[PDB]
């Protein structure tokens, strides 16, 4: 690992600088180096890791969607043969995206999840595992497609099971997990009714628990609740 010689604290400090500079690839490399020190992550450190990789893969997914759309139109009836270039470049971006997902899934499996015993860490990491299998599922076409989809479902489901037993319905990790699992149902599993039901039940159970919160906790919970409502509005 190219970060093996840097102090853990220096990697975390530089990840924060990279975030301020919007250098998300650097941020992700710094956080990968920090994870590879072998120590458990704090709440803030898990946030840095997830923000870094979400921004890297988010850019790759956006580029992949542009290229896939161009490829789909180049294959329609009446379109002119442009050669292999659109497919090749879509494949190049796809392979890079898959590489980033495999890296994140590798950090989670070696060994973040197995050492995560508190709900707030274990649910967070299982949510990430579902997210990165979901990104793989977005591009999957081969023999293992259904197993990729089920790996996302399984990770999200274990996270849901722990969050329902161990976290209040307003916990932002629990809310974000439900938001993303609902999107998995809608976009990956072809299950829009399950997506809508999960978003609605999550929103309503959080609403009923807001009265227990401080103003700062209320702001965090209602932010994610608004995203659930936004998706419900898109879908209904």
């Amino acid at each position: 690992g190219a970060m093996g010689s840097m102090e853990r604290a220096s990697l975390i400090q530089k990840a924060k600088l990279a975030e301020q500079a919007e250098r998300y690839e650097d941020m992700a490399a710094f956080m990968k180096g920090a994870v590879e020190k072998g120590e458990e992550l704090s709440n803030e450190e898990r946030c840095l890791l997830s923000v870094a990789y979400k921004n890297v893969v988010g850019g790759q997914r956006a580029a992949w969607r542009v290229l896939s759309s161009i490829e789909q139109k180049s294959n329609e009836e009446g379109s002119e043969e442009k050669g292999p270039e659109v497919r090749e470049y879509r494949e190049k971006v796809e392979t890079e995206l898959q590489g980033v997902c495999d890296t994140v899934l590798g950090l989670l499996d070696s060994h973040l999840i197995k050492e995560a015993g508190d709900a707030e860490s274990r649910v967070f990491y299982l949510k990430m595992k579902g997210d990165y299998y979901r990104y793989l599922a977005e591009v999957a076409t081969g023999d293992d497609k259904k197993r990729i989809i089920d790996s996302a479902r399984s990770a999200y489901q274990e996270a849901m099971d722990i969050s329902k037993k161990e976290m209040p319905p307003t916990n932002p990790i629990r809310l974000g997990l439900a938001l993303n699992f609902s999107v998995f149902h809608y976009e990956i599993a072809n299950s829009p009714e399950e997506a809508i039901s999960l978003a609605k039940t999550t929103f309503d159970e959080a609403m009923a628990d807001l009265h227990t919160l401080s103003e700062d906790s209320y702001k965090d919970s209602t932010l994610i609740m608004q995203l659930l409502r936004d998706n419900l509005t898109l879908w209904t």
Binding site: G176, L179, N180, V183, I224, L227, L228, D230, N231
Partner: peptide, 6 residues
């Protein structure tokens, strides 16, 4: 288009 995820 991206529905909202966090």
């Amino acid at each position: 288009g991206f529905p909202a995820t966090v």
